[PDB]
Symmetry: C5
Subunit: 205 residues, 5 copies
Amino acid sequence: QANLMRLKSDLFNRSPMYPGPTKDDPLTVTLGFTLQDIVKVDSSTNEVDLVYYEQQRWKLNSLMWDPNEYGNITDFRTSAADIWTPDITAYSSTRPVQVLSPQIAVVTHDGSVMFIPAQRLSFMCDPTGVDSEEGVTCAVKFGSWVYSGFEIDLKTDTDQVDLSSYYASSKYEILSATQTRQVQHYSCCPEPYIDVNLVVKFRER
Amino acid sequence: QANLMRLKSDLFNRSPMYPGPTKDDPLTVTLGFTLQDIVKVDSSTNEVDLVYYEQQRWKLNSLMWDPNEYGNITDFRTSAADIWTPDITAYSSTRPVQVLSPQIAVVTHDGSVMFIPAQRLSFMCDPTGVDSEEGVTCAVKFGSWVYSGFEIDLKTDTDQVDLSSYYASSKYEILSATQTRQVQHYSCCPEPYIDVNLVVKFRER
Amino acid sequence: QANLMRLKSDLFNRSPMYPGPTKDDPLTVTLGFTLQDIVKVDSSTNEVDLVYYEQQRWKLNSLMWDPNEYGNITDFRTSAADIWTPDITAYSSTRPVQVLSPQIAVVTHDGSVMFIPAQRLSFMCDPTGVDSEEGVTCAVKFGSWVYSGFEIDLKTDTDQVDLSSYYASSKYEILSATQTRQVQHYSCCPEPYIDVNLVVKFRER
Amino acid sequence: QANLMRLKSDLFNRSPMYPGPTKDDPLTVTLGFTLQDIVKVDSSTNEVDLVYYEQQRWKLNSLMWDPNEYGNITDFRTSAADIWTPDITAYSSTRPVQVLSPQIAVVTHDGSVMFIPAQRLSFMCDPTGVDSEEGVTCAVKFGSWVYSGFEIDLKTDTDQVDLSSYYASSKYEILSATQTRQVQHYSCCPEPYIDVNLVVKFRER
Amino acid sequence: QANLMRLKSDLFNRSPMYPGPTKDDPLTVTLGFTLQDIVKVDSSTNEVDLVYYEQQRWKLNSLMWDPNEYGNITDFRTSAADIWTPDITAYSSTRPVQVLSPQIAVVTHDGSVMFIPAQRLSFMCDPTGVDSEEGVTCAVKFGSWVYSGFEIDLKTDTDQVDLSSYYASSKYEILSATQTRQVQHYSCCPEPYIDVNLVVKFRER
Ligand SMILES: COc1cc2c3cc1Oc1cc(ccc1O)C[C@@H]1c4c(cc(OC)c(O)c4Oc4ccc(cc4)C[C@@H]3[N@@H+](C)CC2)CC[N+]1(C)C
Ligand SMILES: COc1cc2c3cc1Oc1cc(ccc1O)C[C@@H]1c4c(cc(OC)c(O)c4Oc4ccc(cc4)C[C@@H]3[N@H+](C)CC2)CC[N+]1(C)C
């Protein structure tokens, strides 16, 4: 534990925290979703509740170290509060997202960070037709709240949502689930905006 | 990165925080709304729930810098906790407002700040007649809680609520949505009080 | 800005915070209610929900200053957390009160403080008869939780609750609303206790 | 206020906080309940909600002073965060307890502390028979979560629950309410455990 | 009080907090569940709510002392905030866990820690058949959120859940409850992953 304490002190206590990305030093965040359950549909307010894991990854020069200088530590776990993290947010939630897991990240000696919060999210969806063979389609966009594509770029590893852990006995079965990078341009500004579109088709039985 | 780190230290770590405006140093806050959805109407209690983005802009001389002195940085993002923010509040909410987005501001080198919190708001409105073709009109005033017009002035860029992001499968159809600056006068004191009246006429799908 | 920052620095950063009143240096807190809406009535549990502004005023010697020494500043606004506040409490709530407004107060150069929190309160009341013409009466007492009348006295400026802001389209119509200072003797204790009794008579409109 | 400021500084800003009791230096906490209302009875989940004031009293040598040294001050009010407090817990709650009063205590010159949190508690009870002339009996135990009776001894001043403030128009009549110190033997541990059994008999209307 | 104050200062105020385990300095956490009550069952969302006490035990060399040096103190109670605690998490919750007990742990002179948070948990569970003689079986896995079996190994003293405290009058009767260590291996990586599977069979009473 002596070496890890030294490393953390060197990384965190010995310099001002990373002030986030800028156009001159942009960063790429990879997003991936693991859908666990569709827990609730409300057809009187058009709200649907999902439970999922959101995998985020990024890399910072300021979090790099040489394992040989620290007893060959190649990675460590630490509170998310200890590091900068991206402001990735649902764009059409209807209630504050509910965090279901400890806020702890894994940092690797190449400066890469992996952070996987589990969340319950209520978002806007008209669920009518959910009780049919065809099912229904809902969508919610995820992206930075304040950084344009010039500061934060988003990427997915695959366009397919991970369904391997979807609750087998859910009230709702998943027909398809995709996660797709998009580039928007608002008629006010020249910079691109990026989001990842979570599109889920599902039905009752 | 080095220059941004130095700039924030100069802006935030060297002086005390802006103590807010006064009659001698008044401020103008620009407000605007982007209505995403009407998520609930409760006819038993006369409450209606909105989800919206709330644009706020103002400008502080104490947040100014010369880009040439800081590696040509022209603006930056920072936690809204790092800066003074106006106490803009709904005048007829029935529940604490729920914040749906990160609290992060954009600061520009001219001292301008832009802050766009997304919110779920419950407020007083009698929805009677919402299920007619003529619909129903509700209204909520927004303004400073403790500053009069001598200290904080309000403006809208436009009197038209931004509806271009309105949920396309909402239970409710928006007939009109305006945001209008108003000068109030309580028969207690001379100084004027300013508010922005959000007025929304809508009906069931 | 400079003068104000200097004033606050002098009032808040140079001496320990005011530790609250004692018998030898008692304080008077003036209370007043602006009733905005009766939002909910629950006959299953005998709970009624009110939304109101609670106006509080008191005066501290330690908050005085000479405007001439501070650029003619005669008053200022500041976070409620910067100052001592009375522990004024509803005595028969059934849920934690919910705060609907920013916790900011106005401080004046003679040491007077004005604080007006907006709140939603659930309290004990049997609504039986609310649907009639006579309506129903409910009452709730407000006062310090831990200070006796030897340390904090209360008073009202008028025993008439301010209804000039009551929601015109409430489900309930106010027939009467009074706020009355009471002096209580508790058999446990030789000190006088003071409360303000908010009595509201109302019916379905 | 000068004298009170000195006293708090001497009591609080000189030594570490009291680290809580040990077998070598045990502490006795006195508990007393004032039942204000049985708010809710859920027959579908067997949950009952009470509102009560839980009076806690204990005494510490480290909180003692001589009034002659501090301007005849014999007691003072202070934030509960300023002092050690016992971890008295309801043992079969089903939701986190909700605090309804300010977290402030009264400290007296003999080192005695009195802290009276008003709370709303949901707990496990089968309300079958509540709608009979005989009513139903429910019980809830209170005591330290982590201290044995070797470290914290509990007592009541009376076995009779204070019903003098019970809400006159509750949906429920109280047939009886008692609070009884129990010495408990757990087979895990040779040390005695102590709890206070709150037993309430009640019926509809 | 003096000796304990010394001990806490020596354990907590001299060195940095334990930074958590690593592959070189792994840690075993022992878990044991005491099931108090199955409180809710929702067949429209497939969620079930449990109240239980989760015993957690582990041992750090950095928490050891010689009782002879500290007045024979053999163990002490302290806020869970003063120490490192393992990130043990339910893998299929549908809402943030609710904490029902004080966050206070017991530390023993051999460096061992015992911490027993009482909690209400909502987790994914199809209750179909709960209203039958055979009842239904649900399960939820517990483990570290970010540590693999190389860093945190889990174990149970027994595979039988503690039922000695189950609410006698619950709406649901417990047919069986087991808690068993399991070793997973996720396709991506080679390190073992460890969880404790809590399996409850139950029926309406
Ligand atoms: C639904 O569409 C939007 C999606 C998103 C945003 C904003 C969107 O559209 C809006 C954009 C604006 C207000 C309200 C909006 O609803 C701000 C916009 C604007 C101004 C100055 C700028 O600086 C010079 C600037 O860049 C601006 O444009 C953006 C500001 C923030 C964001 C995007 C664009 C991120 C912002 N956030 C949550 C991410 C997703 C002044 C006023 N003006 C309205 C023109
Ligand atoms: C690791 O598990 C426990 C941890 C702790 C305790 C008890 C625990 O589990 C037990 C709980 C019980 C017996 C044996 C136990 O081993 C009592 C339990 C019970 C009854 C009545 C209650 O009131 C009407 C009640 O609240 C009960 O549950 C608790 C009682 C005390 C404590 C917790 C729960 C605190 C008690 N102690 C000091 C703190 C930590 C009667 C029937 N029943 C046996 C089911």
